[PDB]
């Protein structure tokens, strides 16, 4: 249905969704495996970043797609949460690789499905 950015049970709602449904979200949604490889990437995210969602699948988010996020402030928090098993964290960030510098709010949250982690993004 409608689901809001930052919802307490967002991972429950998104677990139920196909590509088209993920594409209809109000916010960018990326699913990563524990190594940061991109499993899913929705249309809303591509509208923020200019990436083609169909072609970033399989790439590594931190190494290749989003090098500006390779930092203790973003990637560091991702890996801490993958390790702890309790990934659920929110912060502001600026995305600026091969796009106009864009201020965003990011929410990372463990998925219900195996070896899966969400990165949610909205403009601020
Ligand atoms: C910094 O390099 C961020 C880049 C970026 C963030 C999010 C995406 O979906 C794509 C590229």
UniProtKB/Swiss-Prot annotation:
Residue numbers carrying S-(4-hydroxycinnamyl)cysteine: 68
InterPro entries listed in its UniProt record: PAS, PAS-like_dom_sf, PAS_fold, PYP
Keyword tags: Chromophore, Photoreceptor protein, Receptor, Sensory transduction
Post-translational modification: The 4-hydroxycinnamic acid (p-coumaric acid) chromophore is covalently bound via a thioester linkage.
Ranges where the PAS domain occurs: 22-85
One Pfam family recorded for the sequence: PAS
Superkingdom to which the source organism belongs: Bacteria
Gene3D superfamilies: PAS domain
GO BP of this protein: phototransduction; regulation of DNA-templated transcription
GO terms assigned for molecular function: identical protein binding; photoreceptor activity
Function: Photoactive blue light protein. Probably functions as a photoreceptor for a negative phototaxis response.
Subunit structure: Monomer.
Family according to the record: Belongs to the photoactive yellow protein family.
Protein name: Photoactive yellow protein
Organism: Halorhodospira halophila
